[PDB]
Structures are given as C-alpha cells and as structure tokens.
Amino acid sequence: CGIFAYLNYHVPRTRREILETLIKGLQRLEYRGYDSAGVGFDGGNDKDWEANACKIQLIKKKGKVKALDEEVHKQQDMDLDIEFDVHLGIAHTRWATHGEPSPVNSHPQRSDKNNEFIVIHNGIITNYKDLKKFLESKGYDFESETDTETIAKLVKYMYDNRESQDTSFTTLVERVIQQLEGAFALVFKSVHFPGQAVGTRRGSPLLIGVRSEHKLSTDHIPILYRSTTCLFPVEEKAVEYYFASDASAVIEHTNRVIFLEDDDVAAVVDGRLSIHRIKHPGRAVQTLQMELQQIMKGNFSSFMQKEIFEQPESVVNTMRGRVNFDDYTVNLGGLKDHIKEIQRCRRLILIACGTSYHAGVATRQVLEELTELPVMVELASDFLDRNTPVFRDDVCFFLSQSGETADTLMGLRYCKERGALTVGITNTVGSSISRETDCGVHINAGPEIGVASTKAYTSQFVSLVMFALMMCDDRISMQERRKEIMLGLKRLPDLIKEVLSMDDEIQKLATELYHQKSVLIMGRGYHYATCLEGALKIKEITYMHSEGILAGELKHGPLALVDKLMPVIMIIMRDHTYAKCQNALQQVVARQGRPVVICDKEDTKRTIKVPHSVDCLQGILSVIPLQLLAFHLAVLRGYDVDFPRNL
Amino acid sequence: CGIFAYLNYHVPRTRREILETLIKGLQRLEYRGYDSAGVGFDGGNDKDWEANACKIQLIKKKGKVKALDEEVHKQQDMDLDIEFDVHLGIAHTRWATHGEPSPVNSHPQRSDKNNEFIVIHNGIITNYKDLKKFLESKGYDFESETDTETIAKLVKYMYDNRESQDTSFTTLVERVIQQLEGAFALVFKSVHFPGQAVGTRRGSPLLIGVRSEHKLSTDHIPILYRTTCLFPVEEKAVEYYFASDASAVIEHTNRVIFLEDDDVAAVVDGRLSIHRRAVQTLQMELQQIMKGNFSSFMQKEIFEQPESVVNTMRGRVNFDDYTVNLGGLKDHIKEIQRCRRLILIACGTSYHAGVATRQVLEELTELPVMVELASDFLDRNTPVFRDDVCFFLSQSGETADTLMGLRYCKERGALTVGITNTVGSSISRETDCGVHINAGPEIGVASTKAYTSQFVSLVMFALMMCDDRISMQERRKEIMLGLKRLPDLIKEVLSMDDEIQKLATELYHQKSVLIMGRGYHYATCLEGALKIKEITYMHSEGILAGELKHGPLALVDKLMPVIMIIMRDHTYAKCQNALQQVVARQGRPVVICDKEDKNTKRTIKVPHSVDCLQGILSVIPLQLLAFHLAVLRGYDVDFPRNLAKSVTVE
Ligand SMILES: O=C[C@H](O)[C@@H](O)[C@H](O)[C@H](O)COP(=O)(O)O
Ligand SMILES: O=C[C@H](O)[C@@H](O)[C@H](O)[C@H](O)COP(=O)(O)O
C-alpha cells in the first residue's frame, strides 16, 4: 500500500532524524486499517558513518505506525545520535492480504539472515509460486508467507551469479523484474551498494522527489538504454531524494517530483539519479501544486466530514482559471486543442465505475443538450464484458478520481486500440488514465483522503458541465442558456454553504432513520444520479440497504414496497419534471407512504429545502444532504466513517 | 382499469343473469385494476320492465371485484327476479393511482343525485380542472375528486342546452368529447335514452362484441359524418358486449368491432352504428385465459414457458437449414442493416429484456446498441436521428411512456420496430414494422413468459442480421441449436420447483436480499430483483457483480442474504472472484450455476446452454423463488399491492 524511502546524500542527518523522517512518511501513507509497517536502515554505532554501511537493520511491527515509532525509540543497543553524511532508509505500511499480519510478514523483506538485500513492494507477483521453487532448488530458504520475499531472494541470486565483480545494482534489478510477472512498485537497498537506491515499477505508481539548495543539472531526465545524462546538483554534492508510492509523503519536503513509468529502472549512484530501460524520450521533473495542508483533517474529526464541508472551496478550485464570468467564457486548457476535433466526432461515451459513473449519469442530459451528440454512459466492467462496439469517430471520456481503477483503465486501452479519441477526467497528477488519454482535465478538487467520494463527485460534475459549455460556445441560439448555467456556477459556492447550514436538519433526519434497515431514494431526470449516488453513500458508509429508484419506474413494480413502514426519500425539484414528480409523490402517499422530501427552494412528512439553482446544477446541491445523512447515520451507530469495510 | 357493459336487446335476462354477467366481465379485466369496482344497471321492481328504465342503480365498492360481487348480492331492495327483455348495464374496475379507492371515486360516475347520465371512463382528461370550474358556475355540484365526474357533469350540460327535443345520444356525446382533452374510452348510459349505449374512444382501447343466432346484416359498419347499421336481419335478438379488452368478450362470443380514435359508436334500437369498421373474428381460445389446473395465473405462465417459447419460434425458425424468418421484418432488414445504431426503449421487465440481449445484438449486428428506460428517455430529450433503428418492447403495446417514446422517435425520422404481445395495440400499429412475440395472453400482473418470449424474439432478430456473414455461420448454428434444445431445458429447470420452494422457506422471513450478476446475467439479477419486489414485497436489489468492489460490497455480512448467478461463460473467473469477495465478507450466498460447475452448500444447478441464451434458464428459478416466497408470506401472486398490469397512463 505505502512505499517511502529517504536518501540524504551529503546532507548530514542523525539516525534519529532519518527515522523520524521515515516514520513521518508512513503516516502520510497510513490510512485507517493498515496493520503492518517497518523500516530499514544502517545499523552499527560507529561514530564514523562510513563503517556502518555494512549492517542493514530492520525494525518491523504489526499494528499502526504509532506502534512502530514506539518500537523505534525502544531499541536497546542503538544510538540515535550517529551522524550520516550519506544514508538510505526505506519504509513501508501495508494492509496484510496474502499471509497473516505479523512482524515477519511485514516489509521490508530481506534476502538472507544478514540483510544483504532488502526490498519494499507494492502489489502482487503472479508467478511468485514458481519463483519460490526455483530459488529453493538453489538452497535459498524462505521465512515469510509473502510474495515479496521472492524478490529479495531473487536479487541475491542474480548477485550470487554475476559475471563481473562490478555489475551495477541496476543490472541486477533489471534481471529481477525480467523474471517477475504481475504488478509491482519496488525500492531496493543493499550492503553491496551502500548509499544507492534502485526503484522500478510495472502497473503500480512510484515517484521520486528531489531537493537541493543547489541548481539541478536538468528538469528532463533522459532515458539510458542497454552531456547532462542524469540528474544531480551542480555546485556541490548535497541533495535529498524521496521515493514514494504517493505524493502525500513527499509534498512537505519538496514539490519537485519525477513520475516513473512501467519498466523504468531509476537508480541513485553517487548521489546522481538516472533512469534506465532495455528497449529522445525522457522523464520530466515537474512541480506539484499539492500542499501538506490538503491531506490533513484540520479541525474536522474525520476526512469524510472535511471533504463534505469544504465542497464550497473544492468547487471553486475546480473552476479557477477556467471560467470567466465577465464575458461568459469557459476554457479547459487541456481541451482547447482537441475541441474542434471533438465536435467533428459523432458520439460521446462516458466510462467509469461507482460514483464516477454517477457523475456521468448526473451530467448526461446537459451534455446531450449542449453538444447535441448522442451520449452513452457505461459502467466500465460491463463495457468490457460486452466488447462494446467503438469507432474512430467516438470521443470517450474516462472518469476516475484515482486515475488507476483497473476496469476504467482497461476500457481506456480498449478504446485506444479501436482508434477513438480519449479524454481523461481525473484528480491525480501522474495517474495512468491522465497519461494514456490523448488529453484530459484535472478536476483539481484536492486530494480525496476519505473512503467515499464526496468532493470528487461534485468536482467531476462541475468539470463535465464546463466541457459542455465549451462545446456550444459558437451557437447563437444557446448564448442565453450558457449565461444561465454560468451564473449558476458563479452562485454555486454560496448555495453549497447554504445547504451545509441545514446540517442540523439532516441530523434530525438521521435520528429518525437510526433504527431503520432500508430506505428508498426516488428521483428522476437530473436527480436520477442524485438518488443513485445517495443510495451508494448510505450503503458504503452506513451499511444499511439504501436503494435508488427511478421515479418513472415505480408503477412498473417497485411501488409494491411502499407501505406505512418503508422509509422513503424523494427528490422533487422545480424543473420540467416537477409535475411528474408530484405524480410519483401522490402515488407514494396513496399507498400509506410517509416520505421525506428534498425539494427546491420554497416548493408530506419532513422536507429538506435546498436553494433553487439552474436545473442542470441542482444535482450538486441535492446530493449533499444525502452525503451528510450517511455521515450522521454512521456516526450515530458508532461507526468510523474513515475506516473502510470493503478491503 | 377495465370496462365491461352488457346490452341484451330482446333477449330476456333476469336481474341476476345481468349482474352475474357484469361481474363475470370484470373478473376477466380485474388484472388491469383491482383497487375498486362498480356496476350500473336499472332499478325499480316493476314486472313490466318498461317502467324501470327511468331508475338507475349504482353499486360501487372498494376492493377487488370479489368485494363488489358480495356487495351486489345480499341486498334488501334489489329484487333479482325481474325479467328484462331490453336492458343495459355498465361496469368498471378502477386502478386508483391517486387518492383513495373509495366508492365515490370509483366508476360509473354520475351527473346528479338522480343518475341521469352515468359514464365509465378509462384514461385521463388533461383539462378536467378547467371543466370543473365551468360546470360549478352553471349550477352543478361535484362530489368526487376524479376527472371522470367532469365527463358525467358535462354530458348533462349538453343535454340541458340542446336545440331540438330529440337530439341523438351521439350528438350529446359528440359535444362532450369536443371539450375533453387527453385520452379516454367511454361508455355512457342515460335514463332519457333507455337501452341506448354510446362508445367513443381516443388513445384508449374500446371494442364492441356482438352475439346473435340470426344473420348479421353486414361485416363492415360504414363510418358516418354529422344499410348502415349492424343488426340481425329478420328478428331483434342481439347481445352486445362493450369492453376495453377482448378477454371479457371471448367467453360470450368471438365477434367484435375494434373502434378507432374519434369513432362514436352507438347502439340504438339494437342497431350498432358508428359516427364521426369491420366485424371480425377473434383468434383467441378461452383456454388461453384459464388457469387450468394451476392455482394461479402466474404459476401457469411460468410453467408454460416451454410452450410459449415454442410459439414465439413457430413458423419462424427452421433447424434443418438454420434459417430465421420474421415476416414482420422480411423486407426492412435490408434497410435496417444500412442504419448505424439500435436503440431499445421500454419499461420494467420489458427494459430488462433489452439488457438481457444487448450483448448478442452488438455481437451479431456489430452496431452500437443503446438500451433506454422510456421515462428517462423522454425526460432527457435524447438525441435521435434518421439512421437510428428504434425498438419498442411492450407486452401490452399500450404502455404510455414507451408509446410516447415511439412518437418521439417517429417525429425525428427514425425507423421504428415494435416488439409486442398484443395485436392491434398502439405500439404494434404505429411502428413501421414489428414482431408479435405470440406468447399468448399474460394475465398475471408480473411478466413471466413475456420476458422470455421477448428475449427469444430479439435473439431471432439478431440471427437474421448476420445470416450473410461467413465468419458467423458457426456461431449462428450454435445459437439456433440452443434454441432447439431450449424448451426441454426449461422443463429441466421447472423440475427443480420443490428445491426452489425449500430455499424460499429459508428466506421468507428476511427483509432484504442482494442478487448479483454480470455479463449476460446482469439482466437476470435485475429481473429477479424486480419480481421479488413486485409480488413478495421483500427489499430485493440487483447489483452488477463488477461494481461490488466499488461500494455496495460493504453491505454484505453474515446476516445479509445474497444470491449470485455464476455461469460457465467468459465471465466465470470474474464471477468466482466476486464469490470469494462475498465469502470474505462472511456472506453465505445461494449460487445459481451450471450443472457441470466449492464453499457453496446452497446451490441451484440449471442446465448448461449457449452463453447468450443462459439468461432464459437462470431467470426462471428467480421467478419460482418469488412465487414461493409470496405464498409463504401469505400474499396473492396474481394481485400484488400498489399496482396492476400495463401502465397505460401517467
Ligand atoms: O464512494 C464511492 C467510491 O468512491 C467508489 O465508488 C469510486 O467512485 C470507484 O471505486 C471509482 O473510483 P475512481 O474515481 O478512482 O475511478
Ligand atoms: O413484472 C414486471 C411488470 O410486468 C412490469 O415491469 C412491465 O414489464 C412493464 O410495465 C412493461 O409493460 P409492457 O411490456 O406491457 O410495456
């Protein structure tokens, strides 16, 4: 789950400082549920650090990182005051899967009883059964039940069979990954290559942060196959490197990062960073706009609560630099090039999973309205199962907060093979979907740390609307509609705040459903997505059977569930479907239903009155009371909203 | 909502023979609405039946028809022994979608406290509020909250301001429909016009049955405009049967006159005339609307799927040469292949039929296939083009949203195809072409054979669209042999009825059940979930298997009942992963799988078939499960609560 390594090269740090840095990185990567963490570093208490680089020491522990930190400072014969001019430390937090949680099964995994090679690993090796046999036949005995130990044992096998006494650490890892199958991100450390690090990935994210008070030789590292050919400080040697599986563990130290790509072998040798391959392409040193405050709870007791209540801000962040209300223009920079190509295409296909799919349903109508193109919205897993027909004049959008969901990513590659124009709507710089799409939009909602999608849904929503507004900016007959929608976006942050000020009314509703085992959420049109997304939130966070029902489908069967006992929530807004929803309401009440109504500004039982906005934006306001409802219900029932129950 | 009126002209019927005929005609229509019922006949206890036509009697009550039949009998005022040589009685069962199903809101409505004009209405008047404020000013008091009372209070307003002392009943009705907006199918009765019935329609079904041992004067009633009427030649004996459906008339005769929009039929002096036709024979046997030896229509229709599947393929599938021919589409297939997209539009189970066949349609046509819920399709003003081919799946052929979607697509120049189970329905008439699935009448409220016959019908279309591809010949043979073997496999599934019933005894007490599937069985878990909702009232929900890991799986614990559909097709490995996830969450799921397929100790093994046909076999256990659960919970499978069959209005 979480990888972190800290390499100080001619930046003196005490053993304490190094360990504090490693512990701190794991906390950035530590999400609720992890149950195994460890650190690897140079042992020995020789005042001169150059003699302690032949004893790798491991401290691994089951439980939360807090427990690891206590074990660190709780070491008998370990002096934390030794200063290292050069040192590499690696760290890992995990959610034990393959084996049972235990100190042995925690990372790093070692190559022998003297820790000649150690590795931290994110992912799974498919052929790990076969590899363990090949090494055992060569005498290597295993101590863990994890697939990671095979990696540590295999790199020593390559070392034990090297042709020359100076075969590079890179060459060894190159030979290792060539024998691995599956997905992995790896960081290696060895006594035979003191101060050096090797990081490589295949289908699992791995990035490198860099920091130095000196000028760096380049901002675009060229690839070396098997002058400024590598990255290094120019004035002096001092530099710091940060390997990590997520930017959250690097951003507090530096915002200059390199995102590795599949089969890259990045190595730090003599403090200089190079990137090797076997196959002028290069890897860019880029600046992240992320900042530490964005991954902290602040004054909120949970990340779910923070991300719900900060949606006024995240919606604004989504629009910053992209909307101009002075002259009613929208400019998504990532699409200003392909914008005219897109309009020459004949169909829009939105492909996503879960809540990201709900964002497509939530904006499908306005996309049809403003683009006038057919809009198909697909669940990624079903899209793949059916081998859906795709053509060269299709424009395919891929909605993904993480930018890594397997089905959404495989759908992307499916559509690229067939020649379709691909567009990524993501919330994670460097992610796979953001790279492999022809173009894309970063929704810029800030990191989503909570288990459930809250601000990501609303920012995706706003992003797709902004795209719809770009697609009709040349239509005279639509100028008024664009103006109306855009003045809605202008007012939206304050309308969200207005909804959040009704939190007390949502708590009251939560206590009325406290003991209920089901609830039906009914909507149609613009609020079909709203009732589907609310039902998912209440399933995922509250663990009760909430179900979204298309209002127009009631009389076709589902209405049989309505009686005096079945809780019902109906979304009834003042748009063109208003009279129809009034009909559905009369149908529910006719069958002894006592429903709660989320209705528009100044429209049977309790009513949650949200403010009135443009019809194609109401979904953003109407889903928030459902977000809060799931939150408050879970809190009432003693659940930790930040502790996932999916796994 | 059902309509039924009995007009016996010069055929002596006692007051019990007519009342037992009105109720008998409502039971034939009860599945269209069973929230209330009523009847309208002549009162008075005078031997000379001529001195009784001036006294109307209304008997309306809340509940099914069996609640009305008991209200009609055991009365202390109605003498059921008066011989009527000429009499007219109107009846009606109501689907109270709004308000209470009270007797005051049921039909026949009335125009005053003396009942001068009573009307039975099927449909909605889109301007009854405007008609209610006009009549309230002229001196008319309203009692019910329905829109039908504005039709009764209005036919009397045209009678209170006529021009001649003897204006025909047609004239009065013709003036009413001119002030009525929306759809309606009416059958009037007045004391001023004894024995005369008027039957007009507009966007709603309405036919007139005729029985007479004497020769009928003609077989093509000429539509008139404000040697003309249908009647027996020599004698006067004739019995008419107004009704909004053919099942309530077939029992008495198979000679009906299907009216058209704005045709103002009228029976005067026992002569049927149309104002502003073709007397034809019905092609339906009474056995087709009889439960037989089954205790419910739903059970019969499930166990008869081996037959209805055969009927859907009869005369259309030849297994010796592997050819498929649907007459309704023999010519259009040429132009359909030149089109660029298929759109399937339907509601409920009919929508599931499209989900169930979407993949194979994409496979064999190579065209994009979009499946749309009719109500949402209309809400979004979905883009449609001239080179779209739009299919409309409707068992009844009258579902409002599906029908409006049709007219939407026709307005945009699309090619429209109807997949119905009702000849003469609106959807079958107004589409460019179509197919009659020919599954027989479906009486149970929950669709069973209609689903599997639609499924089979869409596959047959797919087989036609690829009959000229060399590369797909083997695939076509694989599918068609699957169809050949399908009836017997359905019998093999049905033989597990008892095993399904035992499972039901383990679930009837639960509040919720999750049904999971993917690929070809996404539709299966959606349709099964809908059925369990509809007749059992359990909170059953279908969950796409591939979406479990994205949130819903958090709802699974050792207590949540789970049904999974794991079949030996290309999603088997994926479905095995979903099964592992469910168990990891402590779920103890029931698995529907193939015979040749573990932790699962609660399995339902269906026979293995072609992947794109397996949905037919996998859904049947869920049909049976829903049936058995509803029995265990003391519910009626034929008359589920809060709804009826065929949604023909808003
Ligand atoms: O609360 C819902 C979850 O956030 C989940 O449904 C999520 O939306 C999907 O797993 C797709 O995630 P991505 O947006 O990263 O693809
Ligand atoms: O059990 C389900 C019901 O039968 C219902 O969902 C029905 O399928 C729809 O009302 C479609 O009706 P039509 O097929 O007659 O259009």
Swiss-Prot record, chain B:
GO cellular component: cytosol; extracellular exosome
Record keywords, A-Z: Aminotransferase, Biological rhythms, Congenital myasthenic syndrome, Disease variant, Glutamine amidotransferase, Phosphoprotein, Repeat, Transferase
Annotated TM spans: none
Pathway(s) annotated for this protein in UniProt: Nucleotide-sugar biosynthesis; UDP-N-acetyl-alpha-D-glucosamine biosynthesis; alpha-D-glucosamine 6-phosphate from D-fructose 6-phosphate: step 1/1
Chain sites annotated for binding substrate: T349, S350, S394, Q395, S396, T399, H550
One Pfam family here: SIS
Disease note: Myasthenic syndrome, congenital, 12: A form of congenital myasthenic syndrome, a group of disorders characterized by failure of neuromuscular transmission, including pre-synaptic, synaptic, and post-synaptic disorders that are not of autoimmune origin. Clinical features are easy fatigability and muscle weakness. CMS12 is characterized by onset of proximal muscle weakness in the first decade. Individuals with this condition have a recognizable pattern of weakness of shoulder and pelvic girdle muscles, and sparing of ocular or facial muscles.
Signal sequence, renumbered to the chain: none
UniProt protein name: Glutamine--fructose-6-phosphate aminotransferase [isomerizing] 1
Matches recorded under Gene3D superfamilies: Glucose-6-phosphate isomerase like protein, domain 1 (3.40.50.10490), Glutamine Phosphoribosylpyrophosphate, subunit 1, domain 1 (3.60.20.10)
Active site per database record: C1 (for gatase activity)
Listed EC numbers: 2.6.1.16
Assembly: Homotetramer, may also exist as homodimers.
Chain positions covered by the region annotation Isomerase: 277-631
PTM annotation (Phosphoserine): residues: S102
Residue intervals of the Glutamine amidotransferase type-2 domain: 1-270
